[PDB]
């Protein structure tokens, strides 16, 4: 996260770290949507042009974390993956359309003050809250500049109008994406950056006081550049694929 601040403790209890076994390193962020399902970005697992293709056994998930590098004894729970599912129409060749993936954990993780799932939106929540100008929240342990944070970082950023998003980039934008970020006029700043991908863009409903995951950190062109915005997977638009995966393969 660029131009964010330190997270408070238990502020993002659904935040998951994707961690590589060998070498031991942060791959991406992710979020906990139930006791056995973790949501991330497809490109955190599969991106052929950079020879990226992780299987289950390459990876661990770390839930309940705050410090980036510490092994947080008695706080975090590290979990092994049972199975990975990447959206079958994820477009890594062109524009990262449908940059979503699910990971099923081998055993249920126990909830705690530091570990708790986020909601997924329904049509009405999405229709209501996904509006230009409405702010959501991005969290991660990724780069502090286009160096690295001691603790989980947070920034709140406004959703940007569809035309402005498209006019900021030569990449072809689909309805399965939205962008967020301040404009140069707006004065304030902040962005996801390297290592933050897969993590959650969340919003707190003013109706039921619940946090919902509206986006997944997907891509940008640099971090916190003027005139450029961060692009996020549109979670509700892909919810049927989510429900399908979970209903077919979950218990």
């Amino acid at each position: 996260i660029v131009e964010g601040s330190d997270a408070e403790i238990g502020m993002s209890p659904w935040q998951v770290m994707l961690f590589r076994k060998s070498p031991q390193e942060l791959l991406c962020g992710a979020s906990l949507i139930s006791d056995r399902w973790v949501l991330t970005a497809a490109h955190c697992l599969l991106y052929p042009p950079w020879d990226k293709n992780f299987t289950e056994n390459d990876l661990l998930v770390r839930i309940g974390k705050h410090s980036r590098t510490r092994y947080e004894r008695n706080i975090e729970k590290i979990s092994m993956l049972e199975k990975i599912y990447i959206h079958p129409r994820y477009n890594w060749r062109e524009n990262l359309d449908r940059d979503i993936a699910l990971m099923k954990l081998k055993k249920p993780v126990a909830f705690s003050d530091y570990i708790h799932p986020v909601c997924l939106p329904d049509r009405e929540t999405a229709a209501s809250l996904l509006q230009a100008g409405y702010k959501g929240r991005v969290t991660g342990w990724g780069n502090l500049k286009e160096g690295q944070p001691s603790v989980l970082q947070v920034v709140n950023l406004p959703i940007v109008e569809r035309p402005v998003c498209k006019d900021s980039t030569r990449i072809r934008i689909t309805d399965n994406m939205f962008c967020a970020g301040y404009k140069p006029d707006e004065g304030k700043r902040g962005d996801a950056c390297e290592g933050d991908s897969g993590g959650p863009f969340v919003m707190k409903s003013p109706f039921n006081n619940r946090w919902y995951q509206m986006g997944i950190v997907s891509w940008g062109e640099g971090c916190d550049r003027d005139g450029k915005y961060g692009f996020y997977t549109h979670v509700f638009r892909l919810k049927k694929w989510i429900q399908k995966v979970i209903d077919q393969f979950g218990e």
Binding site: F19, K21, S22, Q24, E25, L60, R68, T69, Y71, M80
Partner: peptide, 10 residues
Amino acid sequence: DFEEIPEEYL
């Protein structure tokens, strides 16, 4: 750079 995690996880 990362603190060593228990070997039970690896």
